[PDB]
Amino acid sequence: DDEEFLRYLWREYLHPKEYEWVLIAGYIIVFVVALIGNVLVCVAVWKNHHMRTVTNYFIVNLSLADVLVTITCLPATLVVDITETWFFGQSLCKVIPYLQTVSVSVSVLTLSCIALDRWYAICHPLMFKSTAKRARNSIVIIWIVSCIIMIPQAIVMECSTVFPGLANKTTLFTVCDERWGGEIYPKMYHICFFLVTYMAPLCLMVLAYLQIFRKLWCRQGIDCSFWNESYLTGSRDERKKSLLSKFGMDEGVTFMFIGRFDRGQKGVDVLLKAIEILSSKKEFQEMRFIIIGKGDPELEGWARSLEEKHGNVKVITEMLSREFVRELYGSVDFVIIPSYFEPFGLVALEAMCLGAIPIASAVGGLRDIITNETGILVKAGDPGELANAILKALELSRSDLSKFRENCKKRAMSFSKQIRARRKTARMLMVVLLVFAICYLPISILNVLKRVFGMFAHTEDRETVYAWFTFSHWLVYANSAANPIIYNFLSGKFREEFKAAFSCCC
Template sequence: MSGITGNLDCEECFSSAHVANSTDVHSAVDEDDELLRYIWREYLHPKQYEWVLIVAYIIVFFVSLIGNSLVCFAVWKNRHMRTVTNYFIVNLSLADVLVTIICLPASLVVDITETWFFGKTLCKVVPYLQTISVSVSVLTLSCIAQDRWYAICHPLMFKSTAKRARKSIVVIWVVSCIIMIPQAIVMECSSLLPELTNKTRLFTVCDEHWGAEIYPKVYHTCFFIVTYFAPLCLMVLAYIQICHKLWCQQIPGSTSVLQRKWRSIQCSAPTAGQGESVRVQTSTVCAEIKQVRARRKTARMLMVVLFVFALCYLPISVLNVMKRVFGTFKKINDRETVYAWFTFSHWLIYANSAANPIIYNFLSGKFREEFKSAFSCHCYGQDPNRTTRIRKRTSTDSRKSLSTQVNNVDNLSRISDHIV
């Protein structure tokens, strides 16, 4: 993240006017004052669309902070939700909370005022944390896709465990912190108006400073490939295979396979002595139905998360390549339009952080119930029987849904009872 920052200190601007008696000095101060007023009016004062952006930033801030905190709380509170996929989802939420708290306020100020208010140290820290968050998000989504790919397409090749997931999360953060060090090194503060440096900090720029022109081109090309294009392509391929396995192939749990199993049970159980065997096979097939159905729901949710991530990060990725690699905007005439595009693309990054908890709420029944429970306990006080009621209701809904699935697969339960 790069931007222009600064501050207008009125006492600083006019301190010379209080001590100088010369007409020339007063004239110079008046000219500087007029220039600063012009800068404020034309560049720094929020325009109409920027007021809308301020409101949008505020909404995203609270939705992201509350939503991602609830995700972490739900997994921490409920042991049955501590699955491998949910561990990675919590890691994704932690990265979103980090970028929301530290980077979003600074980005809002930069995008609206075009001025860096936060000094040289934060000029290095904030963009560094921003890029770390991007790297953590991409690597976490990649790990989720890899875990689902192994579990569904090649279940015998790799055994995923919670312990391995936690180790992977540690590796993700360490690798992200290391590979993003160059971003912190090259970020420096400078002024676009050196002649006014002693009077104001307006138009102080926090931007990259490289030794030669080739370095930013190489760095940002690699950054685009490593943190966006290559992982996205690999994840898309993985989910295509997962969809083919879950919805198209004749895997255990698909309708035709289950029908063949039930016909086999019907033919191989002519006597009442085999009733117990039929019950066992019935239970096995029902478990397969439930597993495939759960995997389909999880895969659907994760694909939506990936799609939203790709959509939200596409504008800033393309704009950065155009700016840093090809120098497209150096001689642009319509500066206002370009700046509006960059401002909107920055907002989309944070909107992605707010979108993830919303996706979990709509596409995951477990997260939805935990979110409802958290809000109900907060608003109406703790109900000791609420958790039990939620679990019973979830179990009942699951049984009803499972019953529907079984009925759709050639009336499996009725056939089983008839055979027994």
């Protein structure tokens, strides 16, 4: 009667759309999934101390922004897309678009700081001393910048009431939309809006992740299935004696260098000078040197001269197969890596996997790999320091070295594990970036085409354009539901925490 009469009146007022059933269904699904998932992300990182990383701090910030828009903006957007009218008054006409755009800005700047942190950690040779307070300062900056830059958005939003009807106005409708005082202002503002919220951060993040991919996959990594001691037969003593026998050398503490002969990069000049220095001491007779490489013909001549002079020095300018090099690593006592510059100690990791104790310059990746219990670090470029470290290694070799070789093997495996873990994380972040870029493409392009280029002004098919806009709105909100699913599929820690959450209630 009376209650049915009022429902009837709004039905006569509001004209329904044929696709609103799937829109409502999709919004309800995205609402529940985004809410539950992002809440679980937050509680997973907050209640479990193993989740405390800078990346996960940024991920929590992203989930918070997403929860904000899911609770305060998604219902309003659904209602407006269904009814094409603003029922919530003037203040909410300001506030809700402000919250929405602020959350977009927070999201894109959070992804940007994620990309930047990974780039500094991976592509930059240095590392930040601060991790947690760095993330906190970044997050506060992100929110402050986001809230400030979207102030114009809130300023231009206005309620406007339109009175349809020929002569006497019996009905009206209020819309919430941007109010501009000219044709140039919306074009300029929405060009800037597209640049700041979508295009420029996307380009920067794509460049950063290209550099990160190139570093993590093409410039790093060691084939652990090949560089493995399981392929070696017999004990290390037997292999060393067989090696020295085949090389026409007496038994002794065996040092190996492998690399290009150059001046200022791989450091064979430092090694040859250190060998000349050691040649005057009696300990030199207890030592054997295997110098493998090619390059500078003057350094090749110097090395051959040392070989012709000393029976405990052998130089190999021939190209050796990887199986032979693996035999070398698994039988020599020490590998000498006197690089001036060494961004990735690949030789060091390959040698340590096979139990060879590295003696390396403290430069770059060698510093990252080698510790005081897994090798000997020397000042780069100093032949006297290198000779002293070689004498130190001889004195060490007078006793059992097996614990040092085991520490080298464990450290190399652990480093390879870190490399793989960083690869998995970078991959998850790249998927997140790709899904963000897809989810926000339609609305970004449609906003430019409407505001900057003025399309859809006099369109014959306005129903199609309105469907495209409602779809782009929903796709934006579905991004918030998609992120936790991504974390569950591409992160074993998030997956375990989600399983624990869903099991504590079942």
